[PDB]
């Protein structure tokens, strides 16, 4: 049995290789790179930026003082005023660099009127400070706000099922929202993933074949409050048209389900994903209800969410047979 | 009479239960959790973060001084310089922690060149400071900018109505914008919400059945300046096709109306919602006008918005009867 | 001649009145309110917030000192240490409040270990400071980034025209981009705006009737590099179907054109708008070219953008006549 | 051979001219202008803003002191207290302006209770400081987050190809994602770019003619994990319908390909673009595979991405011939 293109948790199961021009591409797309790495690397990357700027200006300030001879008389006196009060060592230069760029500015170490190069540096570093701060806030806010994380509160059922609804034979998976905050402009997709050879003898290692779930009358758009059971009507235009309970129980393919919507707070699109191998599809089954009424409101019991119950009355032939007979 | 799936104000009326894996899911989706709680909890959550960092570093600084014996001679002298000038108590350590991380840095309490562990902490805390600040700005900006709040300046009419337009029998609700700022890419949806049993005897506790309002020619897209009256043409493909004034006045169902659009300033999608129980639909009625002209401009009088007037000339049979006769 | 629903610049020409519940709605939707007012009001609103917090804490600090008797001995001595060094007046209390919340912290005026109420306030105010700062950055960034402003670099032609293209009679306006940065997911709409009475004798003060420009094959989606001339094919399904050059030159209606797209940098949707009164439509005309080639690249001369030239060969009857004959 | 409308890298190849009203339009749309210029100009623009504010308030403070006679006795004494301690020069005034607005506030130079004009300025400048800071963060974050940069990690194949698939003759280009982070709501477009003269003898310098790739059944929507090969079915409704291998090898036109999608982290739409001149299209060719299986996962070898292999069995007539015969 051929292994799965996307895992049940939604993760895609492909490795890329021989992209060999990538680090220049990742550099040109640096932000996308940057917000996708691990917090700890993004953070210490920003830490390096601070250290580097702090050392650099510390060093410049130290030079200025070393050369102005302030290391000898740091506090000044009548008839000698240093560039920056109280920079005596390099530690004291670095302290001043930190205190200025952070804008902590304790004051013991302090710029003077004397050297306009000392002043110019405090000006440059103030601006450099803002710049870096700004990159950081931006990076952190972006990373913080990533809507992929919202998929963790959207749930696909563990199994698909096939079964009859209103005279038609249908593939059915279920989706639900685990928060009271909505999924705006929510809509849904599906695809059949098997390899195939064309009549022109072309080999497609994994062709993706649409699994119509209502796009053409906008019935793929959903208003997901309580769980919805999605329906693919298996008919002449479906790629399960001629697939019967028998075929399925020996067949080798994958169904990929996608729910896309906007996280309500940020209106940023999330993409939730899951998958169903042929072997995870329960022919002749139906989902137990979760929605039931109460005096004032309805309620959804999420225990039953994944649970199916068998409908032995269900045809076992393909939907094609089922028409080529009737 | 069965209670309502969504309230008139737009609020959905369902409780979730037996989600029992949720707190790990809410943790993994922490931001979404965080921006959806109540201001006061988000705020004091960020306050805790400050206090905790402030106490923690205060404590570290106190230790360093306690052990360096700075608590005895805080100001230093010739031949003794403490790690941090003027930390004598723990209160004074906490003050220094606050002053550094806030970057207030009054200066009375002040790091020195002496102990590089003192210096390292001021470096770590400066960076930790930025990080936390950044989370806060992000959280607050996000919460601030939530477009759900925009639904408070979009208005649905209190009643639907059925009535005749250009030879066809139509469901009609009304929507309007209460701001001069627009709703971009605005478009609209509707759904019939009743339970139902399938011919395969399946029970759907609340099926959602589309209420076509023009999707197929993009006539669901609106340019909402003055109020628009939305039209569902009740025809063979409608689920009100065979529903007459009589049926309605004893029927039990809910119509759910949605207006989705982008708040102009932020281009973030809002989702406005309301509902109409069968009992809120006025068969044989029509909305009073609100738009009228003036010398230079038009004007909308919002008093008339909700008001209907009866059209006794209106057929009382279903749209099906109305064709199965003619 | 009836005045125009939307001006040429894109501005809508309607006044709202007898919204009388609005200030509570505008309060609940405060952000949307806030970012839509005039810079100077948003700014001084944020200034008030500062002043108010600064006065408030200044006042609290003054009280604390007044009562601790620090106004008498501000600097302290052996055997007396005030809550906050150097607060002697209220001016000095306000200075301390400003210096702390701004985080300037000059230090002359400075909190001590003595009074934990003094300390608690510095803690509260630091956090209050961050909060307000955060609202401000958020507000300012949002206002700054509003994509409506992008419509100022999108241009509609001053006139529509009717004329023949590939055997069909067509309404044609022109759009163009005045920046080298793109308009992503750009697409376009149109509407006929006249009042009308239904056969059921209903009066619609301004009905909006779609002006198909390719929605059904996604031909309303454009890739706007050089100017595009938009086409409404006037055919049996158009509401200009039976409208001839004569009718137009005495008719009374408005055509509203919309171009929606995402500003490239921010991917926020802008909505550009213009209008054409019947009297602004040039029957039997065509736009002069703007695009011409060069050795290496193409070029658009924007002078010709608006200019039409007459095609006297153009039929003068309606597109209906033009078929009811042939 | 006529030069190309859009380069292979995606860049559009048009110059605008005789926009002569533009600088007022670019000013009204200042943000869009601002975030699109070069980092170094955006940055030094913000630097100017600082300098200007710093000089301005420095100057005001200097005046106040000059006139209060503080330049003579800067430190004060019993019976004389200056507006701002220690402003003796203009350098010292500028230092104070910088220290206040940056909020560094070293403290040596320091506002007093004495002059309420001195105090008022520190208040105004604090607020002015925040404002400018806010513009900067906003500008920098926006520029930082531009999703156009994401196109650098989306790849189009260097060549299109024509070839047979499942009985139909098809144009085929290939797209792929170079990151493991997805492209949400990804979908794709295409256009034929040649000049043309209408039967009414109208000259369109570059008409854009849609190249259907599945829009009508939403098959233009893709789930791009491994590379996808896009298909234009060349049939009666295509503008390559009557184009044969011969025509192509002497023809003069350009095909423009677009992939639009949302960068996963930010959910901001990117627009990737490339182009194929008639001369870059390989009649009778097919892409080498890149996807192959492994024990646990699949893998994509990106070396083969661009590589084609000839299928000599491919018809050489147009798809029209190919039907007008059969
Ligand atoms: C806070 C420390 O987290 P840390 O620095 O270790 O980085 C995160 C952590 O390692 C998760 O395990 C990552 O993967 P996933 O969550 O397992 O995918 C997560 O990815 P994403 O959160 O960057 O996607 C990382 O951010
Ligand atoms: C400022 C203090 O507000 P506070 O901390 O009490 O929290 C808000 C307040 O309680 C409203 O009543 C909440 O619900 P709604 O407005 O009744 O839904 C609102 O929800 P949302 O604003 O978080 O949605 C809360 O933010
Ligand atoms: C900077 C000072 O600008 P100021 O405080 O005077 O406010 C802006 C100015 O008054 C424009 O005239 C306003 O209208 P428009 O530009 O004429 O619509 C503009 O609206 P919008 O920019 O708020 O839309 C205002 O922001
Ligand atoms: C950091 C310094 O970069 P600098 O100030 O020189 O500006 C960037 C640099 O010049 C690139 O070459 C620009 O063009 P592209 O990248 O060649 O288009 C880029 O455009 P975009 O990054 O502004 O688009 C500029 O931002
Ligand atoms: C930055 O993140 C890096 O991105 C690379 C670029 O995608 C990855 O390399 C991946 O892609 C490369 C493309 O050739 C291969 O060489 C590597 O084996 C493969 O791990 C690599 O893991 C990862 O640290
Ligand atoms: C964080 O917000 C929490 O989210 C929970 C998770 O949704 C809610 O519990 C809700 O959902 C749980 C899921 O089993 C139930 O146990 C609770 O009764 C129900 O109030 C709970 O109110 C709320 O404070
Ligand atoms: C905040 O902005 C305010 O919004 C109001 C609410 O829209 C406007 O009043 C407008 O709307 C009101 C609704 O009744 C009318 O009373 C006013 O005449 C009309 O100017 C008013 O101009 C404007 O300052
Ligand atoms: C701001 O960026 C500017 O934008 C102008 C406005 O687009 C450009 O001028 C361009 O457009 C003008 C419109 O007439 C022409 O005069 C110029 O030659 C042409 O370079 C110009 O390069 C560029 O610095
Ligand atoms: K400071
Ligand atoms: K300070
Ligand atoms: K969309
Ligand atoms: K500071
Ligand atoms: K200080
Ligand atoms: K269709
Ligand atoms: K700060
Ligand atoms: K944002």
From Swiss-Prot, chains A, B, C, D:
It is found in: Membrane; Cell membrane; Cell membrane, Sarcolemma, T-tubule. One of its GO terms (cellular component) is membrane. K(+) 3 binds at residues 104-105. Inward rectifying potassium channel that probably participates in controlling the resting membrane potential in electrically excitable cells. Probably participates in establishing action potential waveform and excitability of neuronal and muscle tissues. Inward rectifier potassium channels are characterized by a greater tendency to allow potassium to flow into the cell rather than out of it. Their voltage dependence is regulated by the concentration of extracellular potassium; as external potassium is raised, the voltage range of the channel opening shifts to more positive voltages. Signal peptide: none annotated. The keyword ATP-binding does not apply. Residues 144-326 are cytoplasmic. It comes from Gallus gallus. Disulfide bonds join 83-115. Residues 90-106 dip into the membrane without crossing it. A motif (Selectivity filter) lies at residues 103-108. Homotetramer. The gene is KCNJ12. This is ATP-sensitive inward rectifier potassium channel 12. Residues 64-89, 107-115 are extracellular. GO terms for molecular function: identical protein binding; inward rectifier potassium channel activity. It catalyses: K(+)(in) = K(+)(out). The chain holds residues 41 to 366 of 429 of the full protein.
